[PDB]
Design a protein around this ligand. Structure first.
Ligand code: NA
Ligand code: NA
Lengths: 21, 29, 29, 21
């Protein structure tokens, strides 16, 4: 999930935008 | 601001800034 | 902190604090 | 939506929790 991808690993714009509605 | 470790309120803030008027969903743990 | 006008990052922050490990969805405008 | 209930009017815990997953 987002924590694994952005908190415990380095986040990316690419990944963040997957959580926009 | 997005290319780093982002946790908790820091992550929510990044979602808010990136997603803008789209809004977002935050589902952790 | 919840019983006031909450806009933008202030609203996102309140959702984060209230919802905790549940997470939340933010859909504006 | 949440903006109408919590930003342009006064928010409540009751309303906020409706947006928790
Ligand atoms: Na920006
Ligand atoms: Na609290």
């Amino acid at each position: 999930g987002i924590v694994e991808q952005c908190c415990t690993s380095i986040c990316s714009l690419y990944q963040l935008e997957n959580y926009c509605n | 601001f997005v290319n780093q470790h982002l946790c908790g309120s820091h992550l929510v803030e990044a979602l808010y800034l990136v997603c803008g008027e789209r809004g977002f969903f935050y589902t952790x743990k």
